[PDB]
Structures are given as structure tokens and as C-alpha cells.
Amino acid sequence: MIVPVRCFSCGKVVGDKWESYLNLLQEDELDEGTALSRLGLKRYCCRRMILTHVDLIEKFLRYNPLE
Amino acid sequence: HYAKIRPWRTFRLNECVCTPYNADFDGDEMNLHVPQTEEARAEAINLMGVKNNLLTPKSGEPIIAATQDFITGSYLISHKDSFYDRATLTQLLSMMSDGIEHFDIPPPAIMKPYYLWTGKQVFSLLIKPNHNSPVVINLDAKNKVFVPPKSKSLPNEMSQNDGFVIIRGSQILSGVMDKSVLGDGKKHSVFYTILRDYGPQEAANAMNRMAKLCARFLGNRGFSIGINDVTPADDLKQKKEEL
Amino acid sequence: EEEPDREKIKLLTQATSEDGTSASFQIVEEDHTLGNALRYVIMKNPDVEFCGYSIPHPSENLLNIRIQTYGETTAVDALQKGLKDLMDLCDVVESKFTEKIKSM
Amino acid sequence: VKTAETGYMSRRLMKSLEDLSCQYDNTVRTSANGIVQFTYGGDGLDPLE
Amino acid sequence: TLKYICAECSSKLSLSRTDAVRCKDCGHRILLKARTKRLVQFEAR
Amino acid sequence: EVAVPDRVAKVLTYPEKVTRYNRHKLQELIVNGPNVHPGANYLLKRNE
Amino acid sequence: EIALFKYRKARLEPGTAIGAIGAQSIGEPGTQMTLKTFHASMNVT
Amino acid sequence: YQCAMGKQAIGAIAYNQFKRIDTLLYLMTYPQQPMVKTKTIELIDYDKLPAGQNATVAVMSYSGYDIEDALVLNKSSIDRGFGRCETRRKTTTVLKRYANHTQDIIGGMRVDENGDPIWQHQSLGPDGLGEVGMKVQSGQIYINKSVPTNSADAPNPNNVNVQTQYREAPVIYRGPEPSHIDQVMMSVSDNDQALIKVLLRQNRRPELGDKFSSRHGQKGVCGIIVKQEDMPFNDQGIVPDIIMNPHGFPSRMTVGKMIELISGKAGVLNGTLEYGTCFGGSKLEDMSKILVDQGFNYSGKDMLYSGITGECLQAYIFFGPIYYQKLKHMVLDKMHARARGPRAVLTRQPTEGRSRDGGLRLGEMERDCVIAYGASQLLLERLMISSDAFEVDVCDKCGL
Amino acid sequence: RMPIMLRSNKCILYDADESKMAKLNECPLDPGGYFIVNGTEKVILVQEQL
Amino acid sequence: MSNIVGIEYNRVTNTTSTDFPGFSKDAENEWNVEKFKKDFEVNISSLDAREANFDLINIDTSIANAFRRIMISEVPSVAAEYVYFFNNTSVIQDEVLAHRIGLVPLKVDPDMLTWVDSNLPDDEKFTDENTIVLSLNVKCTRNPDAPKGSTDPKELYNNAHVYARDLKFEPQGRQSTTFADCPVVPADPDILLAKLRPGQEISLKAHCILGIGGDHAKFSPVSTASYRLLPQINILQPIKGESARRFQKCFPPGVIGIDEGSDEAYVKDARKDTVSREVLRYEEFADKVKLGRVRNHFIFNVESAGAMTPEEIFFKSVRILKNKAEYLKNCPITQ
Amino acid sequence: RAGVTHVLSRLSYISALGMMTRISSQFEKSRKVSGPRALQPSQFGMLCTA
Ligand SMILES: [Mg+2]
Ligand SMILES: [Zn+2]
Ligand SMILES: [Zn+2]
Ligand SMILES: [Zn+2]
């Protein structure tokens, strides 16, 4: 689904760092670890949720009751 | 055994009485029946309760005793070097027997070069805490890992790694406890001796007393398995192929 | 509404031995926060010889401290000496912190 | 494969030993008042204690 | 009350009783009821 | 001691008949209700 | 006194259903082992 | 033991997961990919629809509630949404016409006049079938149905009265916890038999009694739930999500989990997801070079403090990210109890199984045990008084 | 009538990609290989013999 | 007894407090005004508007634990609790979107509120300054151009991604002159709350309550609060060889270094070195370098969620421990 | 023959691939002898060993 707003163990707002992360990996392509460390995700518990994150809400919007 | 009304909806009980059920907290569920008449309720607790059935019938060995986090917390208090101050000892004796207990602290193991109790004196207050507690048990027991001594010395306890349990008047004079001194399946144990001499009530009371200490201190101390203790230290790695 | 919380500290009468010198107390609604921070201060009273908190069950909201002391002191008075003393500790930490945050 | 076969084995071993208790004259007897041992185990002692 | 969204054309159409249930625009079989006007509360927990 | 939850104990019920020691306890308990936990569900009369 | 008290509480109590105890005493299927020999033949159950 | 458990955990079943009315399916709110991708789960597309969440585990003996195979969880991590569930159930009914051209008509909404509506009809809607987000709880009717009480058999159609003879027979939501309705749907069969498929769903929080996996054959129920001002912290502030007991490692010999923690910890610090395939994958030799480059230990064991007393632990704790799964068999569905319910028709016994009513069974291999105690008055209760006691008139001579 | 199992030669899911699976309301990632009769979906477990 | 906690290759030692009277023969140092005031310094490091760094020296681990344990549990904060939905016709389930509104940090001071009374009925405690209302309202329409690109719906559809800044604020009949200078906008407006499709719409009035972090973790003002003992690297046997440049490889590029030539191997402040014990496993080296941390020096490195500045968080953490000793000293003991 | 067509198990993504690709059980019911039940060295490339 959508990225969770807050990390499970540490507990800081990380769900604000997905749209700015996705336009930083597609445009002007960095690496993975340098992109995750650019946005300020130092410790490994706050990094493993932007890193992992199966993209699933975009797959569920192929159907709609609008057609 | 007696009921207790609690939060979240699951049955929950101790871990010493877990070996006759062959339970392992895996997801295995157990059923629970209540008596309805006085005639069967007064005999369900008297000759069928837990505190009377501490043994097994097939051998005469205590069947409800130590579990996994019960002797590994009991071993780390007794490895000849766990030396405790006053402030650590009072916290251990307070977390051991949570509510009402007097303790009448013994003299320490070492005097004026700083006052440091041993671990055997912390552990012997679990058996006979008061001056009114009549538990004056004494025994002489082996352990599993017993290497023999130098074969010229007389007693069976001059060996290399703690050897041989000598209790003389509810005080431990030598040795870790270590499985068949309180360890589910052999005789000559501590909780078999209290049950054999000073009733079943004191044996069930002194075994509830161990579970609190081994539940709080074993998490307070820290104990883990890493990856650097499964690796050979290059001599086995040099020797195993050529052998 | 001026009732000074009778549901707070209860002197356990089955634990007090002499009527003094050894007592077990019982809070309501605390945790490990005021446990260690108070038994550190009570242990610095040079007339006590046993102090330690204990939560019997985490599903409840309780804690039991036990004070044992030497002669010429009351175990109730050893709590009150160690509970006013934590106030001065939190007052001197608050004072030294606010005198340096206004300087930088 | 083993537990069902020994579940049938411990089942049938119950029924031939079921009503067999020690009486007040230190003799174990069957249901039809027939005697099997004049004292338990030749010794008359509790195997638990 | 302008309910029963169709499942294929996604048309909001109300049907009368003693009639065959279908969509009058195309003829699709299955159709699902609209979300209520009422209020519902939830805790953020 | 086994520890049962607070919902199994609402539907597991023991017949405690009243005689001179139960009376002051099973009267404060019968006004307490089947919903509040120190309470009771049913009541069988003297004439049954 | 202790050695006669432990023998006082050692004889069998009258009324124990000890046939039912001994029926599920010997019924302990926790062996699951197949023994053999070496330096071979002559298997035995 | 994992192959019988990978096909058992909850997950992210399909893309049309919300447009289907399966009779029972489990969902999961925030799924996560595994950190250690096997080189064959990329072929079968398991990284598209995963079935669990990464958890910063800390293998240590802690709190005593983890003695035998029962891991303890963080309160403030489930509180932020670690492993949220959604059980989704179908309770469909059909309505059909009879032989004499008399079908059944759904309806209701008794406004009760100082009322509006009855508590039984509280969330039902003016049509007769429930709404798309109202709440039902253990008493409410949502699929209200009324059959004709005369045309169930086959008489001739008497024209003086045909329709207006009805018998109210709905089915009532009978569950322990309140659920919500979101997929009420009307359709038609081939022979003009109209059917209504209703779909119930409820959010299930991970609480005390739910079991978890490790992708390595490690079952375990929840030990307790415990706060965040508890379980210990490192120099950066990481508190663990789940604490496992190290005693499940030696006799189970599962050292592949003990490579999984250090291969997943370096996978975060480098950024790239690393591999854990059979007979190869990512070597341990060029694994822990990433650990010493970042500033961590070679073995993945950093010193922790204590949350209950402050001072540092006496040993080194082996903690890092390990992917855990959440299975079926929640304690909300396994909970079961009965005092005095319906009996059997033939043998007057308490009824069999679940969802009729309870009443549990004392086997033949259980009465063997209570004879060995010698308690004779407990066999009169637990076999005659409680289960089946029936007074009877017998005769003295020629006794029948 | 002869029910046809999904993703066969005589099926509608044959040669579908990213636009026809969403219009016909089905996930393009399921394995298929199953029959569906009377609403429920059913497989045929492959039997071995000698 | 040797205040420096020792670090070996498989264990630690000298952990406990060892600063209480009745320990060897002479009592020390029971309270002694003003010896605790004489030996308490604080040094505030680089302090931002969201993150503060400062260390407390010469205290034990019991009063530094209690500040940390209060700082994320017992301090009060404010977050949305009850959400009232109107036409949630989106893909997200109705409790999942209600769970995401609770976990946003709302930038407002929890001193301009009062506590809730959990005994009244429904329309008796959502009055003045006890409850804040937040209203969200958004509908997705089709962007009529859509020239050539099929991308994420910022070009194909208007406002398909809803954010945390859509949580608008409506003041009540009294809190319009008290919340005039500062709104109740969230701490981070760019939080992806939901994404959706045209034909879908969400609208809700979420109430907002004050609470502590022991009930629910959304009432915690701190991301994480912890301490760190600073290590020290006691150097002895000052031989350097070629191994001095090998000795700076096993540490981070901060803490140590060499001067002109080599001649020795010195050390800077050890505030950068995570204890990694890489120099404790070389079989020829464990007789000249010992590692260890200092027990009485706690480097607090606290952060914030955005509601309050962290020095206010620490000041409120110290002050509420003094209040829970007031409330225990001024109460009678009922036997 | 009974018990050859089962309903498709839909719990996760891999349970639908465990009902798929699944060879069944034929005769030689093997109550006590573990002849046709134990694992054999002949099933190397096929008939997964775990
Ligand atoms: Mg099991
Ligand atoms: Zn984090
Ligand atoms: Zn249509
Ligand atoms: Zn007759």
C-alpha cells in the first residue's frame, strides 16, 4: 500500500520521504544507499522502510468504479 | 490448580509445570474443566493438585522442575566470579520475592578490600531467607560436566570446574547448581530434598521464588548467541582437512 | 476534592515486623521510573541496609518497595528522608541546565 | 508412524490392569476378589516415595 | 435515493420492484449498493 | 495457579449455594450483575 | 528417628489404584532407537 | 516445517484483492519485501506480493516470558502498525421461487415510534439488506429475509390469498467482535434465482496469542506485549521490534537465520537487497567488510544498554533485521467456551464442534488418568452429573 | 457445455497483457491452471500410478 | 571501584553503581550539600530547531534513565483520536485511513489545552479547549488536457495525491482569539496520506485530544531519546612501526591520527567512535590498547517530532519528575 | 476415486502455487512400513526434497 507514516521501532516521520525519494532515484539517478542517506535516514531501522516498500497501492488502482 | 482472573484472552501459567503436559507454547491449545459439586471440588485440589504431585509415579523423580531460562540464569550467578555489592544484592533479593519477605543479610564473602558478596550467598538466601524459615536442608550432589580432580586429593570436589555441590545447612559451599541439583529428572536435588523433608508447601514456595529471580535478572544481565561463537578459530580450520 | 489520595501508599501490615525498622510499601500507578531513581537515593542514607522495588505483574499498575534499616531510625522516616532528597536533586539539575541554555 | 501403534498398545494394557488395587490387608486383589500378590512387589513399599 | 452503482459501466441507477435486476444502460448482470449517507466513527488506534 | 481470562470466567459458572457465610457475599455479588465480573448469571430458588 | 520416619512413609497406602498406575507407567514410548553392533550382523528387536 | 508454513501466512494475495468475495481470506495492511531475496523467488514473483514484514529482532534472553518458543513484541510498534490484519468473510444467501409461483421478499425497517430503529434493525437500511460501512455487533440483522410459511410445500394455487402470508426468518451476525460491511451485492442466476452476496470485514490488531514465523521453521506465540521504555537501546536509539530467545538455536541447528541477520543488516547499510539462494548467494567473507566499513562489529554484536535500570548489559547482543511472517490461528478464533447449551437430538449429549455450541470431550485415554489418582467422586460429576443425568423408573422384580 | 480451465487455447485470458486483464477484472499474476464450476474454483490434483 | 566501564573481546566489566556509603569502611558521600552541585556540569553542543545535543557529567545511570524514560512516556502531547467519516469511497479501508491521521505530528503547544474527563457522555467533553477539530475535504477531477505523458496522476488528474496539509483547521467559538497567531498546521505538510482516482472522494472531521505516550505512541513528542557513554582509548606501549597506519584503519576517520613522521599514535576526543572492538582480535595487539567507556558522562542526543523544541522537552521531563515526588511526599500513609 | 479435485487454497500468493504443482498419493497405503513413504535418492532433479 502507501508507505507508513512513522517507523515501527524508532518512530519518526518517514512517510513524508517517499515522493521526494522516488523523484530522486528516477531523475538524476544516484545509487541506493547514497539516495537513502541523502534524505537523512541514518540508522538502519528508518532506512529499511523506504528501501523495502513493495509498491502496491498503484497496482490496486487499475480497477475503479468509474471506468 | 487455582484460578486467577486476568487480561488478554489466553490461558497462561508457569513454566516449571510444563514438562508433564509436553507443552512448548507453540500454538498448542489446552482445555479446562470446572468442578460443580463440593464433593468433587474438595478432592480435585487435595490428592490431584500440583503441589502434591511434584514427582512422577514411574520412577520417583521430580517431574516439574527447571526449564530452559531457569538453569541458565541460575548458572550465571554462580560461575565463581559474579561478585555483588550491597546495592545489587538488595535489588536481586527484592526482585526474587516481590512482596512480603524479611532477609537478615549474612556477612559478606570478603571484608574491607571492597565489600563484595559472592553468588552462592545470594543463592542460599533463596533457600532459607529468614531466621524463622525452617528449611535447613543439606545434600551432596554431582553435576553433568564434572571433570575429575588430580586423583591424589581426597574429596570429590577439588576439581577444575565447580565439581560437586556441598550444601550444609541451607548454604552452598561449593559448585554451580546445574541440572539435577534442581534439574527435572534425577534424585538428590534441592527441590526433592525440601519436598522429602520439609513438606510440599515449602518446596512449592521456594520454587516460585526461583522463577522471579531467573525471570528478571536473566533479562537484566544479557545473554545472546552471535555468529563469532560458531566459527573455528583457524586452528581447527587448519587441522580438520589434514586430519 | 481536598482528599490527599488515600489510594496512594499503603503500609503492608503483614510485612512490618517490629512496628518499625522494616517496612514494605505499595504505590499505585507508577513504573520503573521512580523505582531505581528512588532506591538510589534511599541507599545513600547510611542507616538503611535493604532497599528495592519490585513489580509483581506487569498487567497490574503496582510496585512494592521494601525498606529495612538499623536502629534509631524508622523505615517510614527513611522513605521521607529519601523522597525530599530527590526533589533537591531535580531542582539542582533544573538550575544548572537553564543557566547554560541562555548563554550558548 | 509410531505414535498410533503405541496408542493402541497403551490402550489395551489399561483394561487388563484396570481394577487392581491394594486392600487394607496389604494384599492387591482383582475385581472378583481374586488375589494376585500377597504383598506389592514382594516388598510392600510405595514406588513413589 | 440514487444508489446501486453498476459493476461494469459504473452507472448510478435505481431500480424498481417486480423487475429483473440489471443495468438499463448496457445490460450487465451484477451491481453493488452505494455507500450510506449515515455517519460512522473510528478511533485512531 | 492457572490464570484464566475475564471472558471465559463470564461464561464459566459455579453453583455456590447460600448459607450464613455466603449470604453477606452473594448479596453484594447478585446486585453486581452478569456483566460486571464479580457477579452472577443465574439464580435457582428454594422451591426449584 | 529419621530413618524410621522415612520407612514409615514408604509402605504402600491401602486403596491405591496401582494397577492403573503401573499400566501407564510401563507405557512410555520415548525410545525410538534401533541399536546395532560394529567391530555387524544378528539384529535383535 | 517452513514449506507447511509459507503457504499458511497472511499476505497480499492478488491485484483484484478488494473486488472479490471469497468465503474467507486474510489480508495485511503494510506488506514488505524480504531483505534476503532467494534467486528463485524473483522468478516466481514473490517480491511482487510478499507475505510479511521486516522486524529488527534482538536475540536475547529477556523478561522471562520467552522461555519455551514464545517471542515477545513491542507495544509501541504494534501501536504504529506492525503487522495489521483484515479478516474478510462472506455470508451469502439465495432467495428462490417455489413450485406454486410464490417467492420470498426481503424487507423490514420497523420504525418503532419512539424508536427509529429497533436495535436488531439498527444498521439495515431501507431496502432490507445492510449498508456499505455501518457497524454490526453480535445482535444486528443485516440480510433480513422473510419466507412464505404456506407455499413451502406444493398445494394448488388458491386465488383467494396467494402472497400475504409470510414468516420472518433472517440470519443474525453472531460473532465475538464487531465487524463492518463493505460489499453488499445483488445479482441473478441462470434460472432467475436472485442471490445477495454480503461481505463482512474486521480489523484485527496483533495481540497476545497470535503466532509468527521466521522463514526457517520457527513457530512461536506472543509471550507478552511490553512497552518501548522497556526493551533495550543501542547508541543510536534503536529499540527492537521482537525479542527472540537464543535457546531455540542449538537443538534446532538453524544457523541459516544466524547468517540471515548479518546479511540483512549489511543490505540496509549498503542499500542494495542481497541474496540468500541455495549453494551460493552472498558470501559471508565480503559481507562483514560492509559492517566494519560502516562502523559496526565484525560479528553483528553491538553493546546494548538496559531499559529497566539504565546500565549496560553484561554481554554483547546479536541484533539486526530478520523478516518475520504472521500466520493463521489467531487466539480470537481459537477461543471457545460453554456452560450449558443445546443438547443432541439422539443421545442428549452436548453438541459437537464449534459454531453450533461448545461442550468439550473427555476421551477414553483421559479417564485412565483420573483412576490413577483414585478420586472416585470426580468421575460421577465429569461423566454422569454434568453430561447426561436422567431419572428413570425401574422395577424391582423382573427388572426393566 | 464442457467447462474450460483458465489460460488455455480456448480461453479469453490467452494473450493478455496490462490492459485486458484490468478491463476483464482479473490479476495478471495468478498461475491459472484451475477450473471454476458452481462459483467456487477447483483444481485437479495430478495423480501418479505405477 | 574503577568508574571506567571495561570492554573486552567477549564481555564487559565494572558496570554497577559503586558510589554508595557503607562500601569499604568509610561512608561516601551521602548527600553533602553542595558536593553534587559542585560536581555537575552540562555542555550544550550543536542545537538545531528539531534536534538537540548535550551531555550531563558526573551523575549515575538511575537519574539519567528516568529522564529518558519519562521523556518518551510521561510527557503530554496532542494527536488526533476520533475520526468521523463522510463518504469514504476510496480504495483504502476505513480504519487504515483513520490510523494514518493519528500518526501525524500536529504543530501546536500542549499548554493551551486541558485534560479530558473520561466520565461524561458524548456531547459534554468536546467543548472548549479540550478538543481540536480538523476537517479534510478533497475530490479528484480529471485534468482536461493530458497532452502526451502517462505518468503518476499529477498531470493526468488534479489532486489525486492527498497530503497532510489538507488537514484544515476550523476554530471553535472560543479558540479563535487564542489560536490566532499560530495555526494547528501539522509538522510536515508533505506526508503522503492517500492516493486515489477520479470518482473517489474522502471527507472527514477528525477530533484531536491530549494524552501521554504510555497509552498510544502517537502522543510521544520525541522520535527517539537515548544517551551514549563516551568511550576512551587508553594508549600504552607507544611503539608505532608500520602498524600505526594499520591502527587508524580499524577506527573511523575521526577519533585518532598521526603527526609529522609517525613517532607515536595520539587520539582526539572519542565522541565519534562507535565501540566496534576491531582492534581486539588481532592476536598480536591485545597487550597495548584497551577500550572502555566512562560511566558518569551521558551524551543525550534527543530529537523531536515537530511540536516542541527539545530543550522544552528536557525541561518538562525534569520538572514532572519533581512533581511526582511532591505527590508522594505530601500524601498520608494509610495502613 | 474420491479426493482428486480439491478447492484451490487461497491464503497467500504461494499457497495458490502449492495447490498447483502437486502430485498426489496413489495406493500402497503404508500404515506401519515406511517403504513408499520415506525419501529416496532417485528424486534428484524432480520431486522436491523438502
Ligand atoms: Mg507445539
Ligand atoms: Zn526507525
Ligand atoms: Zn452497466
Ligand atoms: Zn417389571
φ, ψ at D3 (rounded to 5°): -70, -30
For the four alpha carbons of B93, B95, B97 and B98, in that order, the dihedral sign comes to positive
Cell matching residue H349? 449429549
CATH of the domain at J328: 3.30.1360.10
Q: How many CB pairs under 8 A join E and H?
A: 42
Of H79, H131, H186, the CB nearest to E36: H131
Q: Of J217, J232, J252, which closes a domain?
A: J217
Per the structure, how many domains does chain J have? 2
Structural contact between residues B120 and B172, judged by C-beta atoms closer than 8 angstroms: yes
B26/H255 CB distance under 8 A: no
Distance CA J219, CA J56 (A): 27
Cell matching residue H118? 429497533
Q: What is the resolution of this structure in A?
A: 3.4
Q: Report how far apart, in Å, the C-alpha atoms of D25 and of each of D37, D49, H67, K6 are.
A: 12, 20, 48, 65
Q: For residue D1, which residues of chain K lie inside 8 Å, CB to CB?
A: 31-32, 34, 37
For the four alpha carbons of B230, B233, B237 and B243, in that order, the dihedral sign comes to negative
Do chain J and chain B touch with ≥3 beta carbon pairs under 8 Å? yes
Distance CA H7, CA K11 (A): 7
φ, ψ at F22 (rounded to 5°): -75, -25
Structural contact between residues H201 and H86, judged by C-beta atoms closer than 8 angstroms: yes
Q: Which domain holds residue J103?
A: 74-217
Cell matching residue H146? 422473510
Which ligand has its closest atom nearest to the C-alpha of H400? 4
H337/F8 CB distance under 8 A: yes
On whether E23 is known to bind a ligand per the annotation, the reply is yes
Structural contact between residues B105 and B117, judged by C-beta atoms closer than 8 angstroms: no
On whether E41 is known to bind a ligand per the annotation, the reply is no
Q: Report how far apart, in Å, the C-alpha atoms of E32 and of each of E21, H106, H186 are.
A: 11, 17, 6
Please give the torsion angle defined by the CA atoms of residues H42, H46, H49 and H55, in that order, rounded to the nearest 10 degrees: -100
Element (H, E) at B211: helix B199-221
- The reply to whether J19 and J88 lie within a common domain is no
- Domains annotated for chain E, with CATH where assigned, are 1-45 (2.20.28.30)
Distance CA B77, CA A20 (A): 53
On whether A25 is known to bind a ligand per the annotation, the reply is no
User: Which chains share 3+ C-beta pairs under 8 angstroms with E?
Assistant: A, H, J
- Residue identified by cell 444498521 is H123
φ, ψ at K39 (rounded to 5°): -85, 140
Q: What does the DSSP assignment read for I1-50?
A: --PPPSSSTTSSSTT--SSHHHHTT--TTS----EEETTEEE--PBPP--
Distance CA H144, CA H91 (A): 12
Which ligand has its closest atom nearest to the C-alpha of H397? 4
- Could you tell me where the DSSP H helices lie in chain H? 3-6, 75-78, 257-270, 288-294, 331-334, 364-373, 377-380
Element (H, E) at C50: strand C48-52
| Chosen from D9, D13, D16, D17 to mutate, greatest number of chain G CBs within 10 A | D17
- The reply to whether J224 and J328 lie within a common domain is yes
Residue of chain C whose alpha carbon sits nearest to that of H309: C36
Distance CA H264, CA H287 (A): 10
Say yes or no: B58 contacts chain G, CB-CB below 8 A: yes
B55/D47 CB distance under 8 A: no
Q: For residue J86, which residues of chain E lie inside 8 Å, CB to CB?
A: 39
Please give the torsion angle defined by the CA atoms of residues B122, B126, B129 and B135, in that order, rounded to the nearest 10 degrees: -130
Burial B17-55 (b: 16+ CB within 10 A, else e): bbbeeebbbebeeeeeeebeeeebbebbeeebebbebbb
Say yes or no: B113 contacts chain D, CB-CB below 8 A: no
* Residue H297: partners with Cβ closer than 8 Å, 6 or more residues away: H291, H316, J276, J277, J278
Distance CA H34, CA H322 (A): 9
Q: What count of other Cβ atoms lies within 10 Å of the Cβ of residue B153?
A: 10
* Residue H97: partners with Cβ closer than 8 Å, 6 or more residues away: H103, H192, H193
Q: How far is the CA of H393 from the centre of ligand 4 (A)?
A: 10
Convert H376-399 into a string of H (helix), E (strand) and C (coil).
CHHHHHHHHHCCCCCCCCCCCCCC
Say yes or no: G15 contacts chain H, CB-CB below 8 A: yes
* Closest among E4, E20, I37 to H188, alpha carbons compared: E20
Say yes or no: H336 contacts chain A, CB-CB below 8 A: no
Q: Mapping DSSP to helix (H, G, I), strand (E, B) and coil, where does residue K29 land?
A: coil
Q: Of J179, J198, J217, which closes a domain?
A: J217
- Range 290-329 of H in CB contact (< 8 A) with A: 320-321
DSSP state for residue J166 in the 8-state scheme: G
* Closest among B89, B73, B230 to H61, alpha carbons compared: B73
Residue of chain E whose alpha carbon sits nearest to that of A65: E10
Report the first-to-last Cα separation within chain F, whole angstroms: 35
Tell me whether residue J321 is exposed, middle or buried, using C-beta atoms within 10 angstroms of its C-beta: 0 to 12, 13 to 18, 19 or more.
buried
Report the first-to-last Cα separation within chain B, whole angstroms: 58
| Chosen from D6, D19, D27 to mutate, greatest number of chain G CBs within 10 A | D6
User: Which chains share 3+ C-beta pairs under 8 angstroms with B?
Assistant: C, D, F, G, H, J
Of B98, B102, B103, the CB nearest to C64: B98
User: Which chains share 3+ C-beta pairs under 8 angstroms with H?
Assistant: A, B, C, D, E, F, G, I, J, K
Per the structure, how many domains does chain A have? 1
Q: Of J159, J185, J217, which closes a domain?
A: J217
Q: How far is the CA of A47 from the centre of ligand 2 (A)?
A: 7
- The reply to whether J325 and J286 lie within a common domain is yes
* Closest among H194, H187, H189 to H103, alpha carbons compared: H194
Instruction: State the nearest Cα–Cα gap between D14 and chain H, in angstroms.
Output: 7
Distance CA H171, CA H355 (A): 14
CATH of the domain at J170: 2.170.120.12
Residue of chain A whose alpha carbon sits nearest to that of I28: A59
Which ligand has its closest atom nearest to the C-alpha of H396? 4
- Residue identified by cell 493526468 is J156
H229/J69 CB distance under 8 A: yes
Q: What count of other Cβ atoms lies within 10 Å of the Cβ of residue H298?
A: 17
Tell me whether residue J48 is exposed, middle or buried, using C-beta atoms within 10 angstroms of its C-beta: 0 to 12, 13 to 18, 19 or more.
exposed
The residues of H that are catalytic are: 69
- Domains annotated for chain C, with CATH where assigned, are 1-104 (3.30.1360.10)
Cell matching residue E30? 451484477
C36/H310 CB distance under 8 A: yes
Q: How far is the CA of H214 from the centre of ligand 1 (A)?
A: 16
Residue of chain J whose alpha carbon sits nearest to that of B114: J24
Cell matching residue I31? 498461475
Structural contact between residues B90 and C43, judged by C-beta atoms closer than 8 angstroms: yes
Say yes or no: H374 contacts chain J, CB-CB below 8 A: no
Residue of chain H whose alpha carbon sits nearest to that of J12: H314
Which ligand has its closest atom nearest to the C-alpha of H236? 2
Say yes or no: H360 contacts chain F, CB-CB below 8 A: no
Q: For residue H79, which residues of chain J lie inside 8 Å, CB to CB?
A: 216-218
Say yes or no: D9 contacts chain K, CB-CB below 8 A: no
Cell matching residue J53? 545535543
Instruction: State the nearest Cα–Cα gap between K50 and chain D, in angstroms.
Output: 19
Distance CA B90, CA C49 (A): 8
Q: How far is the CA of H392 from the centre of ligand 4 (A)?
A: 13
Say yes or no: D1 contacts chain K, CB-CB below 8 A: yes
Beta bridge partners of J291: J7, J233
Q: How far is the CA of I38 from the centre of ligand 3 (A)?
A: 24
* Closest among H29, H61, H85, H22 to H331, alpha carbons compared: H85
Determine the residue type at H352: E
**Taking the CA of residue B82 as centre, how many other CA atoms within 13 Å lie in the half-sphere pointing to its CB?**
19
Element (H, E) at B240: helix B235-242
φ, ψ at J214 (rounded to 5°): -85, -30
Do chain I and chain D touch with ≥3 beta carbon pairs under 8 Å? no
- The reply to whether J197 and J245 lie within a common domain is no
Distance CA B143, CA B161 (A): 10
Q: What does the DSSP assignment read for J117-133?
A: -TTS-GGGSSSTTT-EE
Structure-determination technique = cryo-EM
According to DSSP, the β-strands at H93-94 and H195-197 are antiparallel
H365/D11 CB distance under 8 A: yes
Structural contact between residues H187 and H150, judged by C-beta atoms closer than 8 angstroms: no
- The reply to whether J117 and J237 lie within a common domain is no
Q: Which domain holds residue A58?
A: 1-67
Cell matching residue J122? 458524548
- CATH class, domain B70-221, is mainly alpha
Residue B107 C-alpha from the chain's centroid: 23
| Chosen from E14, E32, E39 to mutate, greatest number of chain H CBs within 10 A | E32
Q: What angle do CA H56, H62, H66 make, to 5 degrees?
A: 90
Q: Report how far apart, in Å, the C-alpha atoms of F1 and of each of B15, B51, F8 are.
A: 12, 10, 16
Q: How far is the CA of H190 from the centre of ligand 3 (A)?
A: 19
CATH of the domain at A63: 1.10.10.60
Q: What angle do CA H223, H229, H232 make, to 5 degrees?
A: 70
Cell matching residue H25? 481470506
Instruction: State the nearest Cα–Cα gap between I29 and chain K, in angstroms.
Output: 9
Residue H54 C-alpha from the chain's centroid: 20
